[PDB]
């Protein structure tokens, strides 16, 4: 269950790396909101899902 | 650290210095246009 | 073109901050 936390946490950190790298680039490109929009939507959704999964699994960690 | 979050003890000790780098990021961002 | 002066100054600033951080690290517990 510890590894089930840690793989999700590494995934959360790497998704956060992807956000901090790409999302300012997508925002500051003059047509980036037109081009990369569903990618940003799926990235934010995946980020929220990882946060809630880690939060639920910390209850089951005993 | 209380529990199985223990192997993140390296990257915890990088966190509070991160808010200072926004000032330097703004200076580099305004140097990118050569201050204009 | 060339490598721009802002990108030169950023790397000079990082190579200064690293040496000053090593100076504090040698200030704390070294001699």
């Amino acid at each position: 269950m510890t590894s089930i936390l840690q793989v999700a946490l590494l995934a959360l950190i790497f998704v956060s790396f992807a956000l901090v790298v790409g999302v300012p680039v997508v925002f500051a490109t003059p047509n980036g909101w037109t081009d990369n929009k569903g990618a940003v939507f799926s990235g934010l959704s995946l980020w929220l899902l990882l946060v809630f999964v880690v939060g639920i699994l910390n209850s089951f960690v005993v | 650290l209380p529990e199985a979050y223990a192997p993140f003890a390296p990257i915890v000790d990088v966190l509070p210095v991160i808010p200072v780098f926004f000032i330097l990021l703004a200076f580099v961002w305004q140097a990118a246009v050569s201050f204009r | 073109g060339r490598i721009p002066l802002w990108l030169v100054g950023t790397e000079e600033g990082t190579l200064a901050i690293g040496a000053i951080s090593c100076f504090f690290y040698g200030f704390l517990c070294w001699f």
Partner: peptide
């Protein structure tokens, strides 16, 4: 141990200005 924290700090620092590098290269309004 310092050997992992230094590499992690180099990654966290180099996440910063490479945003400006990519936006100055690809044609952003920096």
């Amino acid at each position: 141990e310092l050997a992992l924290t230094l590499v992690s700090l180099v990654l966290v620092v180099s996440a910063g200005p490479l945003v400006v590098v990519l936006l100055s290269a690809r044609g952003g309004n920096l």
